[PDB]
């Protein structure tokens, strides 16, 4: 289980970088924190555009 999760955390970091490219005014840590819950670029992007993060 541990291996899959550590790899997944690397994937989330990458996803946060891709979102930050689009939204440089949004703090990286808030994007990554939201991604922990959503596990989804699309959902976290919805959240940013809705003013939720």
Curated annotation (Swiss-Prot):
UniProt comment concerning the protein's domains: The CUE domain is required for recognition of misfolded proteins such as mutant CFTR.
Taxonomic classification: Eukaryota, Metazoa, Chordata, Craniata, Vertebrata
Post-translational modification: Palmitoylation of the RING-type zing finger by ZDHHC6 promotes localization to the peripheral endoplasmic reticulum.
CUE domain ranges (all copies): 11-53
Residues of the full protein shown: 456 to 498 of 643
Subunit structure: Interacts with RNF5. Also forms an ERAD complex containing VCP/p97, NGLY1; PSMC1; SAKS1 and RAD23B required for coupling retrotranslocation, ubiquitination and deglycosylation. Interacts with DERL1. Interacts (through a region distinct from the RING finger) with UBE2G2/UBC7. Component of the VCP/p97-AMFR/gp78 complex that enhances VCP/p97 binding to polyubiquitinated proteins for their degradation by the endoplasmic reticulum-associated degradation (ERAD) pathway. Interacts (via the VIM) with VCP/p97. (Microbial infection) Interacts with Staphylococcus aureus HIgB; this interaction regulates AMFR-mediated inflammation by promoting TAB3 ubiquitination to promote TAB3-TAK1 complex formation.
UniProt note on tissues of expression: Widely expressed.
Gene expressing this chain: AMFR
Name of the protein in question: E3 ubiquitin-protein ligase AMFR
Localization terms from the record: Endoplasmic reticulum membrane
Entry function: E3 ubiquitin-protein ligase that mediates the polyubiquitination of lysine and cysteine residues on target proteins, such as CD3D, CYP3A4, CFTR, INSIG1, SOAT2/ACAT2 and APOB for proteasomal degradation. Component of a VCP/p97-AMFR/gp78 complex that participates in the final step of endoplasmic reticulum-associated degradation (ERAD). The VCP/p97-AMFR/gp78 complex is involved in the sterol-accelerated ERAD degradation of HMGCR through binding to the HMGCR-INSIG1 complex at the ER membrane.
S-S pairs: none
Superkingdom to which the source organism belongs: Eukaryota
Disease link: Spastic paraplegia 89, autosomal recessive: A form of spastic paraplegia, a neurodegenerative disorder characterized by a slow, gradual, progressive weakness and spasticity of the lower limbs. Rate of progression and the severity of symptoms are quite variable. Initial symptoms may include difficulty with balance, weakness and stiffness in the legs, muscle spasms, and dragging the toes when walking. In some forms of the disorder, bladder symptoms (such as incontinence) may appear, or weakness and stiffness may spread to other parts of the body.
